[PDB]
Structures are given as structure tokens and as C-alpha cells.
Design a protein around this ligand. Structure first.
Ligand SMILES: *[C@@H]1O[C@H](CO)[C@@H](O[C@@H]2O[C@H](CO)[C@@H](O)[C@H](O)[C@H]2NC(C)=O)[C@H](O)[C@H]1NC(C)=O
Ligand SMILES: *[C@@H]1O[C@H](CO)[C@@H](O)[C@H](O)[C@H]1NC(C)=O
Lengths: 213, 221
């Protein structure tokens, strides 16, 4: 015979979505299946490509957090805990998991996680900003560098004397200033005429390296 | 000095029925137990087993057989996880972890990829583009670009450092694009004119390189 607590750890996070930088994140974790008041509960950030990171946690007597802008709290009659992160930035994107510590009490304890909820932080809107366009070359590779535009929607095309070059592909990312920059890569002989042409908010911007006068 | 866990290589690719050894170099250890968690798309991350370094004992959690997953000791006080008789359903990200008080600290994870298709690993082919005069003239700043192409699997880690600093710089990274047996990724670093004279180092890791990063120097000369 063995004696074990009768319990299942059910955790369901909600509140995820796309947020603007500077806003406050508010997440809820609905729990069930185990004795709520006496439990130990935490929030972890799982961003793809990074180490899962502890953010904050709490029980009935104490709470702690990794930063001042991060806090958690409890609603006992509903068996819920909450997460609040003020002043969101791009680094706060990822999958937020509610976690419960389970085990004997020592360093053999495990975390049980819920499915989590996805948070995407994007720059806060600001005045439209047309990009600048620069061509760069290395042997038969051409990069088209597109710097500091807002909003993110644009259309890019690399062409050699009027026709689309092969193996074009576009990479786009936010910067720290709340704008976007982007690189469009293609393959073309180092002596071919090349034009990079960008359309953004109905304006056309371009750079070309001519092969003749 | 703060507990930290290191995991390399960043990925392991296998066919079915093979096995895989995952590495965890744990530094400034504060605990006797090394924990192994698994993450799969759309599933809750969960712990597979816990290993006591002192007692050299590997204890699987319910649902996991010691025949299937088993931790043991390795060179330089390294904990290693062996996953036997690989099936496609084993693919995912495996993190080692350690308790540090009420806080659990996790390694960055190694991605196990199990596929039933024939494959060959292929290392990134890097292509560098350097700041152009026109960019400096128009923006008082310059963008370094590294394109890594034609690698397999679709897992890669890249970072930029400047000499004298050891925090990665705030570079932009594009998505990993491609399919089949050929993926690529571009990253780029825009810096102010003062930093255009300083020396930079560019690093990448990939499973076809094994554990050691490749590093390139970018300097004035
Ligand atoms: C970046 O590294 C290069 C060397 O790789 C440095 O160039 C040297 O500069 C010193 C003067 O400080 C000269 O005496 C050497 O002859 C140079 N060597 C070479 C190979 O060019 C350069 O100074 C470094 N840049 C910075 C900002 O430290
Ligand atoms: C709450 O957590 C703190 C910090 O880990 C711990 O010291 C304390 O004993 C816990 N209290 C309860 C009631 O579990």
C-alpha cells in the first residue's frame, strides 16, 4: 500500500495575443484539480530559441519577481493566478506558461506546465516612415538593404534590365527604435545591371547599379 | 556567481530506431539534481526524468521507461541524456534544468529531429556584405550583413560581438527559410559611425559543425 494526494494539476493560461510595446500584459491562469490555497504557482517565459525563464511566482504567504515591472497575484474563490507585465517590449514575446511545483519538497520537485499562451509584442504605431534603399554586392550575391520604415507592409523586387532575378527572398525585422528594416537577397552576376525597387505606402523608392551610361 | 547550464550541439538529427546523446554542461552548480524537460509544439512542456549527480542515479517520471530515456555522467562533470530507439514522435526541444532556490534555471535546449526520410547534414555557407559608403553618407550608420545558406537541418544560432564586450549585440535576424534539404538565414547589424571603426566578431553554430562555433573577424586593416 502507498499513500498519495488525490490530485491532478490542470492549468489553462489565457490572455495571449498581439500587444503594442509600452502596453501592459495581463494573463490569467485558471487552475483545477489540486488544493489551491496551499499551492505554489509560477509564470515561466518559453521563447523559441532561448532558455525558459522564470518570471515570478507566489504562494499564500510570499511572492517574488525577476523585475519591478513584473508581478503576479491570486484570486482564491476562483482558483486563478494572474500575471502582469508593464511596459512590454520586443524581448517580452514568447509563450507564457503557468507552472505548479510538485513533489516531495526538495530539489527533486518538478514543474508541471500548462499549454501556455502566445504573446507577440510589436512596435507601437507612430508616424509613417519611408525607407531608404541600398544595394550591396558580394560576388554573385546581391543584398538590397531597406532601412527604417513604418508600417511593416512593403513590396520589394530585384531586377536585372527589367526582368526578375532568380532566388529572391525577403527578411524583415523590427529594430529597437520601433521601426522596421529588411534585407532582400538575390543572385545575379557581379557585372549585371541590378535595380532594387521598393513600394511602401504607395511611394516607390529604389537604387540601381547601372552597367552602362 | 549564478547557476548556468550549457547544451551543445544545438540540434541532433536522426532516423528512426537510432539513439541520441544530449549534453548539459552545468556551471556553478547549486544543486545535486539535473532535470530533463521536453517541449513539443502544441503540447505542455514536461519533465522526462531527474538525475542525482552524487548518487549517479537516473529516475524517469511516470510514462517514461528507463529503457527509453536515461541520464548518466560524462567528461568534465557533464550530465548526458540518452534517448533510445528514436521515433518521429520523439522530436522536440530537450532542456536540462536545475533548481536554484525557489527558481528553476533551464538550459537553452537541444533540438532532437527524428525523420523517416534519408538526409545529409550540410554546413552553412556564409556570405558577408559590408557597410556601403552611400549608407554611411545617408544614415551616419552602417549595416553588416551575414547570409548563411544551404544548411541542413533548419536549426542555427548566430551572434555578433564587439571586441572588449561579451554581451551579444542587438542584431536583426530573419526567419529560417527554405525546405527539403536546404535552408538559409540572414542576419544583420546596424551600428553608429563610431562603432564602424571598432572590431567585430561574428559567430555561428550548427549541427554539421559539431559543438565548436565558427567565428569570423571583421576589422579595419
Ligand atoms: C582591430 O584589429 C586590428 C588587427 O587585427 C588592429 O590593427 C592593428 O592596429 C595597431 C595599432 O593599434 C597596429 O600597430 C597594427 O599594425 C595593426 N595590425 C593589423 C594587422 O592591421 C586594429 O587596431 C583593431 N581595431 C581596434 C579598434 O582595436
Ligand atoms: C512560499 O514561498 C517562499 C519562497 O520560496 C517559501 O519560503 C515559503 O515557505 C512558501 N510558503 C508556503 C506557505 O508554502
Amino acid at each position: 500500500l502507498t499513500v498519495l494526494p488525490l490530485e491532478k494539476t490542470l492549468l489553462t493560461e489565457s490572455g495571449g495575443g498581439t500587444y503594442q510595446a509600452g502596453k501592459t500584459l495581463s494573463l490569467k491562469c485558471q487552475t483545477s484539480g489540486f488544493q489551491f490555497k496551499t499551492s505554489q504557482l509560477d509564470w515561466y517565459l518559453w521563447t523559441p530559441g532561448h532558455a525558459p525563464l522564470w518570471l515570478t511566482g507566489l504562494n499564500s504567504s510570499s511572492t517574488d519577481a525577476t523585475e519591478g515591472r513584473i508581478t503576479s497575484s491570486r484570486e482564491d474563490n476562483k482558483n486563478q493566478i494572474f500575471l502582469q507585465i508593464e511596459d512590454l517590449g520586443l524581448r517580452d514575446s514568447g509563450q507564457y506558461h503557468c507552472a505548479r511545483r510538485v513533489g516531495n519538497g526538495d530539489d527533486t520537485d518538478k514543474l508541471v506546465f500548462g499549454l501556455g499562451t502566445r504573446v507577440i509584442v510589436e512596435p507601437r504605431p507612430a508616424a509613417p516612415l519611408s525607407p531608404s534603399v541600398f544595394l550591396v554586392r558580394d560576388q554573385d550575391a546581391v543584398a538590397c538593404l531597406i532601412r527604417n520604415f513604418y508600417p511593416k507592409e512593403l513590396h520589394v523586387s530585384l531586377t536585372s534590365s527589367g526582368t526578375l532575378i532568380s532566388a529572391q527572398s525577403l527578411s524583415l525585422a523590427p529594430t529597437a527604435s520601433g521601426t522596421y528594416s529588411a534585407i532582400h537577397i538575390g543572385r545575379v552576376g557581379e557585372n549585371d545591371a541590378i535595380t532594387c525597387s521598393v513600394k511602401h505606402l504607395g511611394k516607390e523608392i529604389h537604387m540601381s547599379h547601372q552597367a552602362g551610361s | 556567481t549564478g547557476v548556468a547550464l550549457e547544451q551543445r550541439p544545438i540540434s541532433i538529427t536522426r532516423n528512426a530506431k537510432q539513439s541520441a546523446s544530449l549534453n548539459c554542461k552545468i556551471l556553478n552548480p547549486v544543486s545535486d539534481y539535473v532535470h530533463w524537460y521536453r517541449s513539443q509544439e502544441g503540447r505542455a512542456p514536461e519533465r522526462l526524468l531527474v538525475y542525482s549527480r552524487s548518487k549517479s542515479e537516473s529516475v524517469p517520471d511516470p510514462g517514461f521507461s528507463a529503457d527509453k530515456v536515461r541520464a548518466y555522467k560524462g567528461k568534465d562533470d557533464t550530465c548526458r541524456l540518452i534517448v533510445s530507439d528514436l521515433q518521429v514522435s520523439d522530436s522536440g526541444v530537450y532542456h536540462c534544468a536545475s533548481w536554484d532556490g525557489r527558481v528553476k534555471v533551464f538550459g537553452e535546449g537541444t533540438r532532437l529531429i527524428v525523420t523517416e526520410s534519408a538526409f545529409k547534414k550540410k554546413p552553412p555557407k556564409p556570405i558577408f556584405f559590408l557597410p556601403t559608403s552611400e549608407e554611411i553618407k545617408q544614415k551616419q550608420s552602417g549595416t553588416y550583413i551575414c547570409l548563411l545558406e544551404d544548411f541542413f537541418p533548419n536549426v542555427v544560432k548566430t551572434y555578433w560581438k564587439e571586441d572588449g564586450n561579451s554581451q551579444p549585440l542587438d542584431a536583426q535576424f530573419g526567419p529560417i527559410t527554405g525546405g527539403g534539404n536546404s535552408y538559409s538565414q540572414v542576419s544583420w547589424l546596424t551600428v553608429k559611425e563610431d562603432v564602424l571603426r571598432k572590431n567585430l566578431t561574428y559567430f555561428y553554430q550548427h549541427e554539421d559543425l559539431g559543438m565548436e562555433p565558427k567565428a569570423f573577424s571583421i576589422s579595419s586593416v
